[PDB]
Amino acid sequence: APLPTSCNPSDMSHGYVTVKPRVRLHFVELGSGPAVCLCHGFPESWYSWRYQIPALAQAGYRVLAMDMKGYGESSAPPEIEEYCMEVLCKEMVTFLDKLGLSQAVFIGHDWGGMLVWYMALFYPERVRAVASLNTPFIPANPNMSPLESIKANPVFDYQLYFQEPGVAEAELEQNLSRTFKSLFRASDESVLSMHKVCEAGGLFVNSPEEPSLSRMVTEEEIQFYVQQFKKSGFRGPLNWYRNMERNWKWACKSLGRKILIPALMVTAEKDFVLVPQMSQHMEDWIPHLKRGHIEDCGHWTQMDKPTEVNQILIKWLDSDARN
Amino acid sequence: APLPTSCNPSDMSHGYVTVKPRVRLHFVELGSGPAVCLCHGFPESWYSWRYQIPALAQAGYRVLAMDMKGYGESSAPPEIEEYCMEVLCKEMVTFLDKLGLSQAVFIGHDWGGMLVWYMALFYPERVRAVASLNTPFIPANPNMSPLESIKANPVFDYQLYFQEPGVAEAELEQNLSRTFKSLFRASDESVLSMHKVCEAGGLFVNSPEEPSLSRMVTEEEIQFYVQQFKKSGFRGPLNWYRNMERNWKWACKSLGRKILIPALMVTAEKDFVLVPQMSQHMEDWIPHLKRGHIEDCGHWTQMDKPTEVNQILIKWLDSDARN
Ligand SMILES: O=C(CC1CCCC1)Nc1nc2cc(Cl)ccc2o1
Ligand SMILES: O=C(CC1CCCC1)Nc1nc2cc(Cl)ccc2o1
């Protein structure tokens, strides 16, 4: 099961779409057939889709690989508010408007996973079928705020560390080769102590200055993600985490609402931040849910087990999405 | 029959695709469904499609409005050779490669009409159905060269005037407001003496310094085509006309070949350079030919009779192309 076909940057079709005067979302496009929009997570890029991009096109689908707001080619407005769920979601609909797409299958991962879930909650007419990698669908509770929730689970302390503007940026921007080589790694090859990131005084303080090259990614691929963040940097990508109050209230404006479109949740066994058990009760709010699970898969789902992901995604699109 | 919906530049999806290191073709994209590539003529732009673009999308087609090599956003290599039929055609296939499109309906006009005809002759597997506006399909004759052909018909003397590099450029670039206001006009509103352009010492020498605003186009639209040519200029656009020897030989490499894919020729009654009678015998080389004709239509077919064009195009796509 060797690694499948990838994507070379200068051999892609780069599309650009302004959805607001100051906001221009970029993307890569390949294939013909039902539109399938791919949204990455933090701190990825459209590149993290390089294995499923050509395969999805191959299966008979149009692939719009999103370069999510703040990341890379896309616009990066320094304002925190420009990254609250509401704005980001609304711009996606606008993205479809400009392209003249009535609907589109939305497949996200990590933050993009959160993104595509709400894009299925508040804009069903716009989403054909929704699929999420690692990120489960938890309906915001009215009585409990992110305050005592992100402080309930010990791993989430890294997020409180992210809240403060500029702190996590200086570190994350300090060494891009290291930062990305340290991050993109299979579970068994970890280094990050998502235990006490605040007490440690950073997320890399307890790690090698020159980590090795993970078995998942090559040197070149790491260099691509390096040149990518040399533009906007991290303030944008990190801002997604900084709008918790807003995302909370906005999500309460739906309460007894359920996702009724074809949905598929893909749990990754070895992911410690987004553990497969968080999606346990999803079946309730999504009566039209189909499951997926990848063994020996870490957080970076696409880079980790590319052949598995493409097998599950394609099989699900052709039956539930494709119609 | 008021003028149909148009296209606003900043509200479009601008895609870019490099097909050679030094060549990057731009385009606008709108709609979902069978891919339909629109190619303009000289000296137009993707904008000349503004009326059929949203309509074609509306009818259920994906619209790739090409910003043809040399014009506007696209790369403009000063070398003449970079505009010979062969190169231009080959890059289009490469354009499909990069986007991952096995086939695409090709609709051209003027030079793009010549373009899409050869793209149907030498690359059938790549063209679903071909349609040309004004430009008929004349199979290059082995015995007769463009020498005594472009010198047979009196109107074509403007082309011999184009051959010399830089001559027609200085004039065409001299006043873009005038140049384009003088050009984009209905037949009854002419000014251009395509009689003796060489003896006159130019194509505008015998015309008003401040021509009026044609009933077809607004001031803004003229200003768009003005800012467009403020980049590359005209050397590129004019170079298309400068590769006659090559286009001749290259076209001889097919002789007894016929276009067998669904084809549609649209003749425009009032066009004096591309008279509807030039297409008379096309029926022979194209056994699968369907006809179209627009009354009171000048050379600028799309701007002139936008409601007619969209009626013919759509009706033909849904039956022959769409499959
Ligand atoms: O923060 C998220 C995603 C959200 C959790 C709830 C909804 C989506 N995951 C997440 N936090 C990361 C930290 C690092 Cl250093 C690297 C990758 C990460 O992915
Ligand atoms: O150049 C063509 C058509 C091709 C050459 C013969 C068949 C295809 N027509 C053509 N020559 C023009 C000159 C000016 Cl100044 C303006 C518009 C023109 O359209």
XYZ file of C-alpha atoms and ligand atoms in Angstrom:
684
model
C 0.000 0.000 0.000
C 2.546 2.662 -1.123
C 1.657 6.360 -0.774
C -0.813 7.493 -3.524
C -0.447 10.286 -6.100
C 0.298 13.733 -4.642
C 0.023 17.372 -5.780
C 2.737 19.594 -7.260
C 2.021 23.349 -6.633
C 3.096 24.829 -10.012
C 0.997 22.196 -11.784
C -2.266 23.204 -10.144
C -5.134 25.550 -11.051
C -5.141 28.400 -8.529
C -8.503 30.093 -8.187
C -9.168 33.267 -6.186
C -12.482 34.645 -4.895
C -13.026 37.895 -2.982
C -16.081 37.594 -0.684
C -15.584 40.959 1.045
C -13.426 43.935 -0.011
C -10.662 43.000 2.449
C -11.093 39.206 2.203
C -9.908 36.988 -0.653
C -10.016 33.208 -0.258
C -7.698 31.159 -2.477
C -7.977 27.510 -3.522
C -6.756 24.821 -5.915
C -9.134 23.131 -8.312
C -9.007 19.767 -10.088
C -11.558 17.359 -11.584
C -15.069 17.381 -13.053
C -18.413 16.414 -11.523
C -20.147 17.150 -8.150
C -18.382 19.987 -6.358
C -16.494 18.857 -3.288
C -14.914 21.586 -1.166
C -11.955 20.547 1.016
C -11.184 22.541 4.163
C -8.033 22.022 6.245
C -7.386 22.587 9.940
C -4.863 24.479 12.093
C -2.142 25.036 11.115
C -2.380 23.296 7.770
C -3.057 24.477 4.199
C -4.675 23.140 1.022
C -1.499 21.025 0.688
C -2.570 18.701 3.527
C -5.111 17.457 0.961
C -2.503 16.516 -1.672
C -3.304 12.783 -1.428
C -7.087 12.962 -1.542
C -7.166 15.818 -4.071
C -6.158 13.837 -7.197
C -8.025 10.742 -6.009
C -11.313 12.599 -5.471
C -10.900 14.138 -8.923
C -10.132 10.619 -10.208
C -13.356 9.260 -8.670
C -15.462 11.722 -10.705
C -15.657 14.792 -8.470
C -14.783 18.457 -8.857
C -12.314 19.365 -6.157
C -12.117 22.828 -4.652
C -9.180 22.584 -2.233
C -9.699 25.536 0.129
C -6.767 27.595 1.388
C -8.789 28.643 4.468
C -8.841 32.269 5.626
C -5.627 33.390 7.288
C -3.572 30.623 5.708
C -1.215 31.160 2.796
C -2.548 32.678 -0.418
C -5.762 33.755 1.279
C -6.231 37.125 2.948
C -5.232 37.506 6.570
C -7.002 40.284 8.482
C -5.179 40.770 11.862
C -8.502 41.344 13.618
C -9.574 38.491 15.876
C -13.278 38.987 15.059
C -12.512 38.199 11.409
C -12.142 34.570 12.429
C -15.250 33.912 14.501
C -17.351 31.026 13.196
C -20.146 33.258 11.910
C -17.943 35.378 9.630
C -15.905 32.430 8.315
C -19.058 30.388 7.610
C -20.869 33.283 5.928
C -17.890 33.889 3.635
C -18.061 30.264 2.483
C -21.621 30.719 1.314
C -20.449 33.899 -0.418
C -17.639 31.744 -1.901
C -20.348 29.525 -3.453
C -22.296 32.604 -4.586
C -19.371 34.026 -6.568
C -18.654 30.659 -8.199
C -22.321 30.041 -8.859
C -22.621 26.782 -6.966
C -26.034 26.050 -5.493
C -24.649 23.252 -3.357
C -21.334 21.597 -2.539
C -20.219 18.612 -0.502
C -18.213 19.947 2.443
C -15.384 17.838 3.879
C -13.306 19.370 6.619
C -10.703 18.400 9.183
C -9.746 19.867 12.550
C -10.849 23.526 12.499
C -12.227 23.027 8.999
C -14.100 20.110 10.536
C -15.790 22.465 12.975
C -16.350 24.791 10.011
C -18.114 22.259 7.753
C -20.306 21.089 10.631
C -21.835 24.511 11.182
C -22.033 24.953 7.411
C -24.378 21.949 7.583
C -26.316 23.249 10.601
C -27.137 26.797 9.431
C -26.907 26.385 5.619
C -28.349 22.978 4.513
C -29.532 24.262 1.139
C -25.856 24.932 0.458
C -24.373 21.578 1.591
C -25.006 18.371 -0.399
C -23.376 16.004 2.115
C -21.056 16.786 5.034
C -17.948 14.864 6.183
C -15.566 15.589 9.057
C -12.139 14.190 9.911
C -11.459 13.851 13.653
C -13.665 16.778 14.678
C -16.992 15.464 16.074
C -20.250 17.422 16.208
C -20.995 18.650 19.716
C -24.061 20.938 20.012
C -23.141 23.914 22.188
C -24.818 23.670 25.597
C -26.671 26.808 26.806
C -25.882 26.224 30.501
C -22.162 25.487 30.079
C -19.727 27.999 28.578
C -16.271 27.269 27.052
C -14.875 28.626 30.338
C -15.371 25.508 32.459
C -15.257 23.175 29.432
C -11.817 23.947 28.021
C -10.730 23.841 31.680
C -12.412 20.479 32.269
C -10.146 18.463 29.963
C -6.363 18.728 30.729
C -5.238 18.662 27.079
C -7.099 21.846 26.140
C -4.781 24.010 28.269
C -2.806 24.636 25.068
C -5.797 26.635 23.826
C -5.832 28.975 26.827
C -2.163 29.440 25.918
C -3.316 30.420 22.410
C -5.838 33.044 23.605
C -3.189 35.640 24.459
C -2.408 37.448 21.152
C 1.200 37.325 20.009
C 2.459 34.906 22.689
C 2.048 31.640 20.754
C 2.929 33.538 17.569
C 6.490 34.464 18.525
C 7.167 30.794 19.287
C 5.340 29.292 16.299
C 7.027 31.808 13.976
C 10.467 31.519 15.642
C 11.525 28.434 13.648
C 9.204 27.269 10.869
C 11.338 24.257 9.930
C 11.332 23.134 13.557
C 7.728 24.180 14.310
C 6.374 22.178 11.398
C 8.805 19.253 11.686
C 7.888 19.042 15.361
C 4.169 19.156 14.580
C 3.676 16.940 11.520
C 4.427 13.582 13.141
C 2.726 10.241 13.663
C 1.584 9.575 17.245
C 4.409 7.146 18.041
C 6.864 9.873 16.934
C 5.451 12.672 19.151
C 7.440 15.335 21.037
C 4.701 17.794 22.051
C 3.696 17.872 25.699
C 0.011 18.828 25.472
C -0.049 18.408 29.255
C 0.908 21.732 30.807
C 1.737 24.049 27.912
C 1.272 27.193 30.048
C 3.359 25.996 32.993
C 6.063 24.903 30.558
C 6.102 28.387 29.041
C 5.481 27.260 25.487
C 4.529 24.274 23.350
C 8.087 23.535 22.146
C 10.127 24.335 25.281
C 10.117 20.601 26.064
C 11.309 19.387 22.638
C 14.447 18.873 20.492
C 15.860 21.951 18.727
C 16.337 19.837 15.609
C 13.574 17.191 15.520
C 13.882 14.470 12.898
C 11.908 14.185 9.667
C 8.680 12.296 10.414
C 8.043 9.144 8.340
C 4.881 10.864 7.049
C 6.429 13.954 5.457
C 9.498 14.699 3.321
C 11.855 17.677 3.653
C 10.331 19.377 0.602
C 6.795 19.141 1.964
C 7.962 20.757 5.209
C 9.665 23.480 3.166
C 6.356 24.172 1.391
C 4.511 24.744 4.685
C 7.458 26.921 5.701
C 7.287 29.277 2.729
C 3.505 29.327 3.109
C 3.540 30.804 6.616
C 6.283 33.273 5.675
C 3.528 35.592 4.436
C 0.623 35.919 6.867
C 2.412 34.108 9.671
C 0.322 32.695 12.511
C -1.838 35.522 13.909
C -4.616 34.660 11.487
C -4.485 30.848 11.912
C -4.360 31.316 15.683
C -7.264 33.790 15.726
C -9.702 30.926 14.991
C -9.147 29.854 18.606
C -9.705 33.401 19.930
C -13.467 33.808 19.276
C -14.951 31.395 21.822
C -17.587 33.698 23.335
C -18.978 34.523 19.902
C -18.927 30.935 18.593
C -20.774 29.951 21.746
C -23.644 32.426 21.483
C -23.909 32.041 17.713
C -24.203 28.265 18.144
C -26.935 28.637 20.757
C -29.035 30.267 18.017
C -30.221 26.871 16.738
C -30.804 24.811 19.898
C -33.127 21.925 18.987
C -31.790 21.832 15.428
C -30.335 18.681 13.845
C -28.118 18.009 10.800
C -30.403 16.110 8.417
C -28.157 15.893 5.362
C -25.923 12.848 4.626
C -23.118 13.086 7.202
C -19.955 11.054 7.762
C -17.714 11.264 10.860
C -14.178 9.877 10.540
C -12.557 9.017 13.878
C -8.759 8.537 14.098
C -7.757 6.062 16.859
C -4.374 7.592 17.812
C -5.472 11.262 17.860
C -5.097 12.478 21.450
C -6.519 16.003 21.116
C -9.567 14.888 19.093
C -10.159 11.459 20.609
C -12.664 9.218 18.729
C -14.835 8.977 21.844
C -15.861 12.653 21.613
C -18.061 11.692 18.654
C -19.800 8.918 20.610
C -23.287 10.476 20.842
C -23.297 12.213 17.443
C -25.802 9.614 16.163
C -28.564 11.502 18.008
C -28.283 14.992 16.438
C -27.507 13.411 13.042
C -30.120 10.698 12.168
C -28.421 10.384 8.788
C -24.944 9.562 10.076
C -22.519 7.040 8.627
C -19.284 6.173 10.408
C -15.641 5.889 9.543
C -12.608 4.963 11.625
C -8.914 4.725 10.772
C -6.579 2.490 12.778
C -3.069 3.692 13.673
C -4.009 7.198 12.566
C -2.770 10.276 14.384
C -4.104 13.838 14.233
C -2.739 14.699 10.769
C -5.196 12.214 9.258
C -4.430 12.881 5.571
C -0.622 12.701 5.786
C -0.741 9.781 8.222
C -3.034 7.326 6.415
C -3.679 8.747 2.912
C -4.699 5.407 1.358
C -7.261 4.743 4.086
C -8.824 8.227 3.945
C -9.246 8.111 0.174
C -10.860 4.690 0.461
C -13.450 5.844 3.020
C -14.110 9.261 1.442
C -14.617 7.958 -2.114
C -16.811 5.023 -1.021
C -19.039 7.399 0.959
C -19.316 10.098 -1.743
C -20.416 7.660 -4.446
C -23.310 6.385 -2.334
C -24.568 9.213 -0.106
C -23.252 12.408 -1.725
C -23.201 11.669 -5.488
C -26.934 10.854 -5.154
C -35.796 42.190 -25.299
C -33.633 44.299 -22.912
C -29.933 43.428 -22.502
C -29.442 40.317 -20.260
C -27.431 39.945 -17.033
C -23.759 40.945 -17.306
C -20.519 40.315 -15.367
C -18.894 42.506 -12.723
C -15.075 41.891 -12.502
C -14.558 42.027 -8.700
C -17.471 39.604 -8.243
C -15.934 36.841 -10.330
C -13.781 33.789 -9.592
C -10.375 34.362 -11.203
C -8.517 31.138 -11.924
C -4.900 30.938 -13.127
C -3.086 28.031 -14.798
C 0.563 27.902 -15.869
C 1.008 25.550 -18.866
C 4.681 26.366 -19.464
C 7.168 28.124 -17.171
C 6.790 31.445 -19.013
C 3.091 31.058 -19.881
C 0.157 31.528 -17.488
C -3.385 31.598 -18.869
C -6.044 33.343 -16.773
C -9.818 32.909 -16.820
C -13.084 33.546 -14.988
C -15.238 30.668 -13.796
C -18.946 30.426 -12.997
C -21.537 27.643 -12.850
C -21.716 23.869 -12.348
C -22.118 21.021 -14.870
C -20.470 20.198 -18.258
C -17.351 22.291 -18.769
C -17.720 24.948 -21.421
C -14.602 26.944 -22.304
C -15.183 30.378 -23.878
C -12.490 31.884 -26.091
C -12.581 35.451 -27.384
C -11.089 36.987 -30.497
C -8.832 39.949 -31.384
C -8.667 42.309 -29.658
C -11.197 41.265 -27.057
C -10.962 39.696 -23.570
C -12.996 37.357 -21.363
C -15.253 40.394 -20.800
C -16.723 40.129 -24.321
C -18.485 37.048 -22.901
C -20.176 38.927 -20.041
C -23.680 38.304 -21.448
C -23.380 34.613 -22.244
C -21.275 33.838 -19.168
C -24.039 34.062 -16.510
C -26.630 32.636 -18.893
C -24.557 29.553 -19.734
C -24.001 29.025 -16.008
C -27.756 29.535 -15.550
C -28.539 26.837 -18.136
C -26.578 24.243 -16.134
C -23.033 24.526 -17.460
C -19.640 25.186 -15.923
C -18.181 28.244 -17.579
C -14.454 28.729 -18.038
C -14.193 32.202 -19.617
C -10.702 32.204 -21.175
C -8.538 35.327 -21.058
C -6.629 34.126 -24.176
C -2.816 34.267 -24.325
C -1.437 37.760 -24.767
C -4.611 39.425 -23.505
C -4.961 40.970 -20.052
C -4.272 38.825 -16.993
C -2.647 36.129 -19.114
C 1.069 36.003 -19.900
C 2.318 37.879 -22.930
C 5.581 36.576 -24.420
C 6.847 39.179 -26.991
C 8.002 36.399 -29.307
C 5.880 36.004 -32.427
C 6.313 32.208 -32.456
C 4.565 32.037 -29.077
C 1.315 32.758 -30.899
C 1.352 30.285 -33.766
C -1.690 27.993 -33.837
C 0.270 24.900 -32.746
C 1.620 26.406 -29.514
C -1.657 28.119 -28.559
C -3.662 24.945 -29.221
C -1.234 22.693 -27.351
C -1.371 24.973 -24.303
C -5.167 24.621 -24.216
C -4.881 20.856 -23.907
C -2.302 21.461 -21.166
C -4.889 23.868 -19.654
C -7.312 20.909 -19.459
C -4.547 18.672 -18.081
C -3.823 20.968 -15.134
C -7.533 21.323 -14.306
C -8.139 17.619 -14.788
C -10.780 17.880 -17.478
C -10.956 14.976 -19.903
C -13.169 16.923 -22.265
C -14.683 20.375 -22.620
C -17.074 22.067 -25.010
C -15.126 24.702 -26.928
C -16.892 27.854 -28.104
C -14.795 30.518 -29.734
C -15.190 33.708 -31.720
C -12.948 35.458 -34.245
C -9.380 34.287 -33.497
C -10.709 32.061 -30.722
C -13.043 30.709 -33.380
C -10.064 29.652 -35.467
C -8.576 28.307 -32.236
C -11.509 26.086 -31.244
C -11.805 24.736 -34.778
C -8.293 23.299 -34.777
C -8.830 22.146 -31.201
C -11.584 19.974 -32.727
C -9.457 18.850 -35.687
C -6.311 17.687 -33.879
C -7.708 16.950 -30.376
C -11.225 15.348 -30.619
C -10.809 13.319 -27.412
C -10.490 16.680 -25.687
C -13.500 18.471 -27.253
C -17.080 17.434 -26.404
C -18.766 19.727 -28.948
C -17.390 22.681 -30.893
C -19.052 26.016 -31.681
C -17.719 29.047 -33.566
C -19.010 32.607 -33.858
C -18.389 34.227 -37.258
C -15.202 32.273 -38.025
C -15.975 29.447 -40.499
C -13.902 26.287 -40.932
C -11.774 26.417 -44.060
C -9.358 23.471 -44.505
C -5.958 24.858 -45.525
C -5.245 24.088 -49.185
C -1.816 22.528 -49.961
C -1.450 24.244 -53.356
C -2.442 27.757 -52.217
C -0.518 29.662 -49.558
C -1.770 32.640 -47.458
C 0.336 34.790 -49.808
C -2.098 34.926 -52.730
C -5.130 34.323 -50.487
C -4.902 37.271 -48.118
C -4.114 39.247 -51.281
C -7.131 37.850 -53.135
C -9.773 39.509 -50.943
C -9.476 43.359 -50.640
C -10.538 43.514 -46.961
C -7.628 41.411 -45.721
C -5.094 44.134 -46.565
C -5.399 45.221 -42.911
C -3.670 41.976 -41.975
C -0.644 42.648 -44.190
C -0.575 45.937 -42.298
C -0.494 43.895 -39.064
C 2.466 41.706 -40.122
C 5.081 44.422 -39.575
C 5.923 44.304 -35.824
C 5.354 47.507 -33.892
C 3.656 49.459 -36.698
C 0.027 48.629 -35.851
C 0.994 48.646 -32.160
C 1.986 52.313 -31.917
C -1.391 53.251 -33.430
C -3.541 50.759 -31.496
C -1.786 51.746 -28.244
C -1.770 55.501 -29.002
C -5.327 56.086 -27.696
C -7.062 53.162 -25.992
C -10.308 55.070 -25.364
C -10.457 56.016 -29.037
C -9.098 52.698 -30.363
C -11.729 50.698 -28.515
C -14.571 53.194 -28.941
C -13.791 53.230 -32.663
C -13.721 49.443 -32.836
C -16.623 48.237 -30.680
C -19.487 49.427 -32.862
C -22.498 48.001 -34.658
C -22.171 47.840 -38.466
C -24.423 50.843 -39.144
C -22.186 52.877 -36.774
C -18.845 51.996 -38.463
C -15.874 54.334 -39.030
C -13.124 51.871 -40.014
C -12.047 51.829 -43.640
C -11.032 48.192 -44.105
C -10.454 49.099 -47.760
C -6.886 50.337 -48.086
C -5.434 50.347 -44.574
C -1.827 50.363 -45.870
C -2.310 53.161 -48.410
C -4.114 55.181 -45.739
C -1.145 54.754 -43.407
C -3.106 53.235 -40.549
C -6.518 51.885 -39.565
C -7.699 55.028 -37.761
C -6.213 57.782 -39.952
C -9.610 58.060 -41.660
C -11.721 58.381 -38.488
C -12.907 60.886 -35.838
C -10.466 61.741 -33.042
C -13.331 61.471 -30.570
C -15.779 58.824 -31.870
C -19.096 58.518 -30.053
C -20.134 55.798 -27.615
C -21.621 52.907 -29.607
C -25.161 51.856 -28.650
C -23.694 48.434 -27.803
C -21.200 49.450 -25.121
C -21.160 51.838 -22.162
C -18.305 54.139 -21.105
C -17.382 51.849 -18.195
C -17.104 48.780 -20.413
C -14.767 50.705 -22.722
C -12.744 51.765 -19.682
C -12.393 48.097 -18.680
C -10.897 47.122 -22.052
C -8.667 50.177 -21.695
C -7.152 49.206 -18.349
C -6.849 45.643 -19.652
C -4.509 46.510 -22.515
C -2.493 48.880 -20.307
C -0.453 45.849 -19.233
C 0.625 43.648 -22.162
C -0.472 46.145 -24.793
C -1.026 44.865 -28.318
C 2.160 43.059 -29.416
C 0.838 39.775 -28.097
C -2.745 40.117 -29.464
C -1.312 41.186 -32.814
C 1.213 38.321 -32.944
C -1.649 35.842 -33.625
C -1.766 37.331 -37.133
C 2.017 37.031 -37.576
C 2.416 33.215 -37.803
C 0.803 32.483 -41.169
C 3.533 30.266 -42.639
C 3.499 28.028 -39.573
C -0.291 27.833 -39.273
C -0.350 26.868 -42.936
C 2.085 23.961 -42.771
C 0.760 22.761 -39.417
C -2.761 22.682 -40.881
C -1.602 20.695 -43.911
C -0.654 17.937 -41.456
C -4.218 16.554 -41.455
C -5.353 16.840 -45.088
C -8.259 14.415 -45.562
C -9.337 14.824 -41.938
C -12.852 15.905 -40.930
C -14.376 17.288 -37.696
C -16.749 14.530 -36.564
C -17.839 15.921 -33.200
C -21.054 17.970 -32.746
C -20.294 21.323 -34.395
C -22.243 24.586 -34.641
C -21.333 27.526 -36.921
C -22.914 30.902 -36.103
C -22.956 33.332 -39.032
C -23.522 37.080 -38.401
C -25.247 38.807 -41.375
C -23.680 42.281 -41.012
C -20.064 41.146 -40.373
C -17.980 42.394 -43.296
C -14.599 40.832 -42.435
C -16.065 37.411 -41.600
C -18.954 37.291 -44.054
C -21.490 34.448 -43.512
C -20.820 33.153 -47.030
C -17.293 32.010 -46.115
C -18.889 29.161 -44.158
C -20.978 28.040 -47.142
C -19.268 24.693 -47.821
C -18.461 23.772 -44.202
C -21.198 21.091 -44.322
C -18.781 18.847 -46.239
C -15.830 18.633 -43.788
C -18.271 18.560 -40.845
C -21.003 15.881 -41.401
C -22.262 16.672 -37.893
C -22.872 20.373 -38.445
C -25.778 22.429 -37.136
C -26.303 26.022 -38.218
C -26.957 29.344 -36.574
C -27.435 32.828 -37.989
C -28.059 36.174 -36.327
C -29.793 38.999 -38.202
C -28.576 42.599 -37.848
C -25.420 41.312 -36.130
C -22.034 42.898 -36.678
C -18.572 41.487 -35.970
C -18.709 41.904 -32.189
C -21.396 39.199 -32.041
C -21.725 38.989 -28.231
C -22.012 42.733 -27.515
C -24.198 43.301 -30.585
C -26.922 40.687 -30.129
C -26.432 39.132 -26.639
C -30.016 37.834 -26.325
C -29.848 36.075 -29.688
C -26.455 34.449 -29.044
C -27.529 33.090 -25.654
C -30.684 31.677 -27.205
C -28.788 29.795 -29.952
C -25.870 28.672 -27.766
C -28.021 27.312 -24.913
C -30.477 25.542 -27.252
C -27.580 23.831 -29.028
C -25.670 22.820 -25.894
C -28.673 21.131 -24.275
C -29.235 18.888 -27.308
C -25.874 18.165 -28.963
C -23.262 18.958 -26.279
C -24.960 18.059 -22.958
C -25.482 14.563 -24.418
O -8.109 23.035 18.357
C -8.258 22.096 17.575
C -9.513 21.915 16.724
C -10.806 22.345 17.400
C -11.136 21.553 18.666
C -12.651 21.683 18.844
C -13.217 22.054 17.481
C -12.033 22.136 16.519
N -7.352 21.060 17.335
C -5.960 21.244 17.312
N -5.239 21.874 18.220
C -3.954 21.767 17.758
C -2.751 22.222 18.295
C -1.554 21.966 17.607
Cl -0.043 22.553 18.264
C -1.568 21.259 16.416
C -2.779 20.789 15.862
C -3.932 21.071 16.587
O -5.205 20.736 16.282
O -8.722 38.447 -37.583
C -9.927 38.263 -37.830
C -10.498 36.878 -38.102
C -9.445 35.807 -38.294
C -8.555 36.032 -39.504
C -9.342 35.434 -40.668
C -10.279 34.389 -40.061
C -10.012 34.414 -38.559
N -10.927 39.249 -37.892
C -10.693 40.536 -37.421
N -9.746 41.345 -37.838
C -9.926 42.472 -37.090
C -9.240 43.694 -37.077
C -9.656 44.698 -36.190
Cl -8.800 46.211 -36.137
C -10.735 44.489 -35.349
C -11.436 43.266 -35.352
C -10.986 42.305 -36.249
O -11.478 41.073 -36.442
